[PDB]
Amino acid sequence: SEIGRTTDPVRMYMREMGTVELLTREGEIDIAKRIEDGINQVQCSVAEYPEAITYLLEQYDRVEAEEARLSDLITGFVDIDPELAREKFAELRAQYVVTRDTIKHATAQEEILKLSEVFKQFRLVPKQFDYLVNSMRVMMDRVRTQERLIMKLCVEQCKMPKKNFITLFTGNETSDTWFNAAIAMNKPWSEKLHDVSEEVHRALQKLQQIEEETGLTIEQVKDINRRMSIGEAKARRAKKEMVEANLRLVISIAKKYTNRGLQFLDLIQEGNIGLMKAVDKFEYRRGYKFSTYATWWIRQAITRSIADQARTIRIPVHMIETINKLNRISRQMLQEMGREPTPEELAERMLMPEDKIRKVLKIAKEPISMETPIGDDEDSHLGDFIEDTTLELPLDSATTESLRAATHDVLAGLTAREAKVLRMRFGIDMNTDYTLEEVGKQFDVTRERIRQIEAKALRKLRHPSRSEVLRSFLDD
Amino acid sequence: RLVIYEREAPEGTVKDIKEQEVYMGEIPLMTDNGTFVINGTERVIVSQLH
């Protein structure tokens, strides 16, 4: 056994990946058949709940007047043109209505099963079928969460036996007939929850609407949903066997992308995501091999992840493709001319203007490491030569402080009103500068008078008696 | 010379040959005095005792 011998996650992955053998042309077909039988079982278990079929026939009468098209409702039929769907929808509606009234109780299990097997014929688009199964999951999980809030409160009270709290709770479904039997033992635990016997009502009386909103029994709903779970675990275990058998295909494709910015296991994992999508989308009834379809999705995922995350500064996919196209045009022009082309002629063989190609050539460059050795030494690196350009020079800070002092000096040599409106008009020793109207309203004076005051104060400061300190803070 | 053999023969004889001149790289030339001008500056490739 090779366990504990290597550190490489590539070797560990290849080691655990090679323990699944490749499928034949026949192995892919019956794995795909297992997937489609799992999904068919999920659908025939969905058919027991009626409102999903009601929503689907709502969708069809919306297709009738074209609020939508049935090309988005069904992908085809198995025993898309819109005339056969009329036949199948009519025969399905004639089944749903003939099931709706027949309620009894042994007779009620003939029509539901034949409607299930006649609803099996519709191979829906994934969106509608997923909507139906998620709708049923929400119905069953809210019903289930009040089902276990029934026991949530029973744990809120005291010690919790529910080994035999389930004895006659099954089947009554209308009232507290099962609830009265709990105090019939008169053990202390059977005390507690009973004084909460009123507060429990709106849980199991909210059942009062839902058993009138679903039509079928609590365990009937729960068990068609557990049959849905069995069907989807069959379809999910069969999808896992098709992904696990085809990981060599992903490595086979991913080895051709190995040095474009992403590492080999990164490419393998992105291609594995593409392969899982391919398994979800594959159709074996087209007669093609799984490799033929799956290569498209694996290559899509790998190239998309290279466009997404191979670069520090991310370039969008449209510019990534412009760069790739420019590069292969440059390769052709370098081969056919023996000389690296200039952007002028590189813009004439391409369809693009020259100023567009110049920025495309300036746009595709990867950052240098600041641990790059300069001089190819190991003592001085590129980061040692890069300067903080946001630092204020200490002579500039000292000039700023001297200028604050000088304007403080000249503003002390003005009237208190003029120095105030001139410290307020500008942001001097305030956090914000003000407009003529704000300075005026603070003084309860007009805008134009404040303009006059500040213009006069500026004219005073223009005189060389008050200006020779400040004129030193100017340049050529 | 791209020489194409056909599929099935005990000899594998040629369908055709497409022979032409490809440009693979430029080789830096040594000057009359044993130096190379590389990115404008004269360089010396020191010999190696290995």
Binding site: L422, F426, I428, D433, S467, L470, R471, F473, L474 | -
Partner: protein, 100 residues
């Protein structure tokens, strides 16, 4: 915007532009010393974000702020030589000045 080789440099007197030709490049044969401008160049800048004190300073003396900053090539300090050669390499699509 593009940087511009020019003899029209802000905050630099006519004395420091004495040995630059009309293209802003030093003459060949010019005896220069440290700090002398060899090639005059200005970089376009913006958003000067004036401090309130220097904002008042420019309100009193009415001096506009430069939209460009002096980015010239100067002689290194302590170095005093003679300009013996000037080469101008211009890109295709850029217009050659009188010196080029």
């Amino acid at each position: 915007g593009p940087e511009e080789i020019t003899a029209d440099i802000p905050n630099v007197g006519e004395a420091a532009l004495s040995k630059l030709d009309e293209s802003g490049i030093v003459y060949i044969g010019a005896e220069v010393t440290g700090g002398d401008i060899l090639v005059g160049k200005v970089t376009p800048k913006g958003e000067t974000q004036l401090t309130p004190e220097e904002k008042l300073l420019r309100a009193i003396f009415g001096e506009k702020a430069s939209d460009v900053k002096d980015s010239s090539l100067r002689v290194p300090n302590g170095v005093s030589g003679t300009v013996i050669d000037v080469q101008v390499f211009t890109r295709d699509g850029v217009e050659k000045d009188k010196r080029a």
